[PDB]
Design a binder for this molecule. Structure first.
Ligand SMILES: [Zn+2]
Lengths: 182, 174, 91, 59, 97, 50, 241, 99, 124
RNA sequence: CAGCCGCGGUAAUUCCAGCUCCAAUAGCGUAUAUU
């Protein structure tokens, strides 16, 4: 579309082919670009899970404050989300509405975990290294980039053995032992 | 062979020029006037030229001070009172309660002065005249315009106080 | 060309740094950079480096100021440290 | 520290005293050294220098 | 100085190192001690940061520049003096000779 | 007091030259140039606003 | 700056103007006719590639009000290479030669001068500089040379008369294009010796606004000149507002 | 200068590793080959070095003097800010008594 | 008047009536009644030391939508007052500019969108 | 926060050289009242 003239813009104020109100600012596309999300529906599945969390938090808030049921369930939810890694802290109840985002879940995906662990320089590099078969979480090889890492499961995200990446880093430090297969 | 990390091409709202927000995307230090000493305007001399503001006329009428005669008594010198187009337009917008002020502004001893700006805002118009040329004396009783003229160096300020006009920042008036 | 900039690059330094050529002459604050296009001319009624080295009083001033800067730069350093530590060994 | 005192008995009367450096570094007399007699051990809040002078203020 | 005599503001002169202690050098004061102590504290703070980084290093980190960089037998990084190569081909060597 | 007024006037006359450009008469000798240089990026013209 | 001294010539922000850098900076223009001096000014010879000699001329700000303005820091000089300039008040043509140098071979300078004896010098200079057209005629009556001048890009006015505002208006209404530039040199003593210079400049600017020239910028030519002003403005025939 | 221990240097992360060149012991062919002019070129090298040294020293001197001046006038403006703030504090209480 | 829970119950008697369809105590009240009563108490506490512009700011609504909502609400208020005047029924006095609070106001939560009065006419 | 008080020394010591700057000037401050 060419640039509208002045008299045309007044008659065509609402016209926009690229930004619609139902797009919600292309927040989904922004988040997928930040965390290299490949599947299109991943943001919306994550958003539905966040919506369940926020709906439950709203109901617990509408419960009376000095309710043992309310306090127990809010602490249960805070502990569960913190253990998964979605919540950075357990201090505030209000984080169950303010700090539950899609990006918070996407920061627990495997390439973001590797990039934070300095295993890969970019999230896209981490994605490619995952699909190329270099990454194991424990004994198990993970070639799915969408795999979500728990706080406990962070400690076993490591390079697979016989990896050219692992041999390269050992050879850089001059600590490569070929008996160990490197 | 296929590339790795394949993603679907979508709209990059940060960097697409078709969007309006991305579509939107020498040094000048003015010289100090040669009419001025450090705070003293030395080029100014009679006959002075007095840019009148609307409330100056209104307070002149309330205190029954003649405009030309009162200015001549205040300055002890001949003066040229100038009313700009925006000042006369403000007096005309003031309505039917101020037709006496309108007529006393229409008095032919007051010389008119054309304006080539949009809208009718006497404060910015007079301040722009002042910031350009140092030959004017600003007559006003508005507090904000008084503060602006006091911040501008080398510009005399006239006001209606009590029985007659009072001058300020003109060293010649003794 | 690159060769032209190589052969005139000192003349373009004595103009970039002309504020340190005469103690009595002072200039306006200009962060002059070598332009992408220029030319070398001669005034009609020897380069600047050759004239400045031919002037002898300027050479004396440059040498004196350089020696003062050398004193300021070397004061308190390794030579001072060794002389201070040698004063202890001497007794 | 040396030259402040002449014997370990003199040190032992003044043990626990505030001392300070001409630089301004504060310290404490801690114990009397066995040999030689007038010397003592002191603890300061920072490392001091061999150019320093230790002073004890009395009246 | 509203109510201070100019004799109240006299200069108190600095004392020097003793002539028996002149072998040790200059007598420090608070102004010299502050420089010495500030220098030590800056050095110790950056050394603490470096020790913390060395402790919290991940063995499994990978960089593409690991292919370029080399480590000597002592375990330290080799930094080329001239490299930004070092070796000349025979074709270059013949022309230069 | 006259001497102090004299030296105050000399100080103010020296300061005014640093504040703004001051007419000192026309050139008498041949044109040597600008002894302080020429700036092409600096504009001293006071600009009209509306 | 003496003979044989080396300088570095670099372009100015204004097109067609250059700076010679050395121990002392110079404003220079490229000589249309190399090997001649109009008024005994210093000239700079640059060898440029066979190499052909190219010569530049020093623009004296004490001698030329346009050079005084450029050195004092004007923002917009409408005089540019390739443009048609109407010079009013040409006189002997000292600044006219530099205007010719700035507009270059593609440009045209219509230099209007009234007196015949400086007009002889202007005609003689027009031989060496083919882009200068001498108009030996009163600038107060522009209807006489309307067959000679057609549709200039800029109007420069160096004339010192009490009615220079009417002179500029009469020439701009005929020959100046819409959205064109007007550069005016104002001498307060020649306009009105009674009132002060600030009053004179204010009245002249207001007269331009009446005659539909919008003043863009204002400059006083110190230390080169006393009570001299340059007004640069745009001829907005449609409307100043 | 700061001396980092070689154990810490050995264990530093990849981004944080220190680049420390070694001195060269042997003359290289390029070092033997390199041609160094003399006479007027040597005098030009001396002249340029002295000029650049004086330029850098003068710039450093001017920056230090400007730093002292701005520190003093910043202290003056701090005092002016405190007195203006106190006056406005008094004025606000004096106004709100009327309103 | 110094007593608190009595004045609070009197002030919030309309919200409890609207949403409890007593459970006035804070340890019993649940749901929308709890949310709106907490909002009322917090707004009342913030009113005295908060600047009114930053305290009460309406939800953003398009002009035609908000004007239509105000017109329909004013029709409801005028109808209610007209029937309570025909069948002679005493009503609480309301200020000249402010809207009258009714059951539709409390249920619909219209006060957030249209405000207590018209600020422009109040300023004029 | 302050500092005429330091360790010796009063013919004893030549030291921020008498620390720098501002304004009025044979005049120039303070207190209280008052426009
Ligand atoms: Zn106006």
């Amino acid at each position: 579309v060419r640039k509208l003239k002045h008299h045309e813009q007044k008659l065509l104020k609402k016209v926009d082919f690229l930004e619609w109100k139902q797009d919600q600012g292309h927040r989904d596309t922004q988040v997928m670009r930040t965390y290299h999300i490949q599947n299109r529906e991943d943001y919306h599945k994550y958003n539905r899970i966040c919506g369940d969390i926020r709906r439950l938090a709203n109901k617990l808030s509408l419960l009376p404050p000095t309710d043992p049921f309310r306090r127990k369930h809010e602490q249960l939810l805070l502990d569960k989300l913190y253990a998964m890694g979605v919540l950075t802290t357990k201090s505030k109840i209000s984080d169950l509405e303010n700090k539950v985002t899609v990006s918070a879940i996407c920061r627990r995906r495997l390439p973001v975990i590797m990039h934070r662990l300095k295993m890969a320089e970019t999230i896209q590099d981490a994605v490619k290294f995952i699909e190329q078969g270099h990454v194991r979480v424990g004994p198990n090889l993970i070639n799915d980039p969408a795999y979500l890492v728990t706080r406990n499961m962070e400690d076993y995200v490591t390079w697979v053995d016989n990896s050219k990446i692992k041999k390269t880093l050992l050879r850089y430090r001059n600590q490569i032992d070929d008996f160990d297969f490197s | 062979t296929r590339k790795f990390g394949l993603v679907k091409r979508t709209l990059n709202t940060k960097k697409d020029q078709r969007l309006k927000k991305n579509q939107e995307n020498t040094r000048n230090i003015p010289q100090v006037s040669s009419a001025l000493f450090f705070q003293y305007n030395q080029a100014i001399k009679p006959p002075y030229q007095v840019l009148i503001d609307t409330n100056f006329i209104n307070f002149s009428i309330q205190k029954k001070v003649d405009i030309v005669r009162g200015m001549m008594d205040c300055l002890l010198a001949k003066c040229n009172p100038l009313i700009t187009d925006c000042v006369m337009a403000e007096l005309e917008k003031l309505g039917p309660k101020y037709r006496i002020a309108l007529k006393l502004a229409r008095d032919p001893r007051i010389k008119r002065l054309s304006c080539s700006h949009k809208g009718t805002y006497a404060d910015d118009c007079l301040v722009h005249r002042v910031l350009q040329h140092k030959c004017y004396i600003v007559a006003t009783n508005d507090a904000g315009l008084k503060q602006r003229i006091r911040k501008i160096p080398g510009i005399p300020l006239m006001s209606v106080g009590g029985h007659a006009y009072v001058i300020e920042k003109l060293p010649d008036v003794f | 060309d690159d060769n032209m900039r190589r052969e005139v690059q000192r003349d373009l330094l004595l103009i970039k740094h002309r504020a340190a050529l005469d103690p009595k002459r002072h200039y306006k604050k200009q962060r002059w950079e070598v332009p992408e296009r220029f030319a070398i001319g001669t005034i009609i009624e020897s380069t600047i480096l050759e004239t400045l080295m031919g002037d002898e009083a300027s050479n004396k001033y440059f040498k004196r100021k350089y020696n003062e800067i050398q004193e300021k730069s070397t004061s308190g350093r390794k030579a001072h440290y060794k002389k201070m530590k040698e004063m202890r060994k001497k007794r | 520290i040396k030259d402040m005192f002449s014997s370990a008995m003199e040190v032992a009367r003044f043990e626990g005293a505030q001392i300070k450096t001409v630089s301004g570094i504060r310290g404490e007399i801690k114990r009397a050294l066995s040999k030689p007699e007038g010397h003592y051990r002191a603890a300061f809040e920072d490392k001091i220098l061999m150019s320093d002078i230790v002073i004890l203020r009395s009246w | 100085a509203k109510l201070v005599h100019d004799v109240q503001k006299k200069q108190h002169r600095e004392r020097s190192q003793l002539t028996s202690r002149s072998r040790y050098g200059f007598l420090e004061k608070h102004k010299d001690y502050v420089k010495r102590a500030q220098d030590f504290h800056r050095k110790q703070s950056t050394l603490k940061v470096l020790r913390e980084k060395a402790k919290e290093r991940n063995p499994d980190e990978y960089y593409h520049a690991m292919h370029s960089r080399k480590t000597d037998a002592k375990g330290l990084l080799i930094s080329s003096r001239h490299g930004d190569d070092e070796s000349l081909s025979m074709d270059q060597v013949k022309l230069l000779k | 007091s006259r001497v102090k007024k004299r030296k105050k006037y000399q100080k103010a006359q020296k300061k005014l030259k640093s504040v703004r450009a001051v007419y000192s008469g026309g050139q008498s000798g041949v044109y040597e140039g600008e002894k302080t240089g020429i700036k092409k990026g600096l504009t001293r013209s006071v600009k009209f606003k509306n | 700056a003496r003979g044989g001294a080396k300088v570095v010539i670099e372009p100015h922000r204004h097109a067609g103007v250059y700076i010679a850098r050395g121990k002392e900076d110079l404003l220079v223009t490229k000589n249309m006719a190399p090997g001649e001096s109009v008024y005994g000014e210093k000239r700079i010879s640059v060898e440029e590639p066979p190499p052909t000699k190219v010569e530049y001329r020093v623009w004296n700000p004490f001698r030329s009000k346009l050079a005084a303005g450029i050195m004092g820091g004007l923002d917009e000089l409408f005089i540019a290479p390739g443009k048609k300039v109407l010079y009013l008040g040409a006189a002997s043509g000292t600044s006219v030669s530099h205007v010719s140098d700035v507009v270059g071979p593609e440009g045209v300078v219509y230099a209007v001068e009234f007196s015949h004896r400086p007009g002889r010098e202007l005609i003689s200079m027009a031989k060496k500089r083919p882009n200068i057209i001498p108009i030996i005629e009163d600038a107060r009556h522009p209807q006489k040379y309307r067959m000679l001048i057609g549709m200039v890009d800029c109007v420069f006015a160096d004339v010192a008369q009490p009615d220079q505002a009417r002179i500029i208006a009469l020439n701009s209404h005929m020959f100046l294009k819409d959205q064109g530039g007007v550069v005016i040199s104002i001498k307060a003593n020649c306009i009105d010796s009674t009132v002060d210079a600030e009053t004179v400049f204010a009245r002249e600017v207001q007269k331009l606004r009446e005659e539909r020239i919008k003043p863009l910028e204002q400059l006083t030519l110190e230390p080169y000149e006393r009570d001299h002003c340059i007004v640069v403005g745009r001829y907005m025939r449609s409307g100043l507002k | 200068g700061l001396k980092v221990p070689k154990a810490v240097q050995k264990e530093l992360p990849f981004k944080s590793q220190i680049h420390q060149m070694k001195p060269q012991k042997k003359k290289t062919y390029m070092a033997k080959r390199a041609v160094v002019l003399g006479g007027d070129e040597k005098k030009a090298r001396s002249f340029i070095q002295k000029v650049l040294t004086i330029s850098k020293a003068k710039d450093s001197k001017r920056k230090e003097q400007k730093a002292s001046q701005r520190k003093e006038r910043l202290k003056k403006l701090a005092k002016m800010e405190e007195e203006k703030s106190q006056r406005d504090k008094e004025k606000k209480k004096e106004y709100f008594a009327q309103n | 008047q110094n007593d608190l829970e009595l004045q609070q119950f009197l002030r919030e008697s309309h919200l409890l009536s609207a949403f409890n369809n007593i459970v006035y105590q804070d340890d019993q009240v649940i749901g929308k009644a709890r949310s709106r009563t907490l909002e009322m108490r917090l707004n009342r506490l913030s009113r005295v030391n908060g600047h009114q512009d930053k305290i009460n700011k309406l939800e953003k609504v398009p002009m035609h939508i908000r004007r239509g909502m105000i017109d329909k609400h004013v029709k409801r208020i005028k109808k209610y007052e007209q029937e309570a005047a025909e069948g002679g029924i005493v009503l609480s006095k309301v200020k000249k500019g402010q809207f009258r609070k009714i059951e539709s106001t409390y249920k619909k939560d219209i006060e957030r969108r249209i405000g207590g009065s018209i600020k422009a006419r109040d300023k004029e």
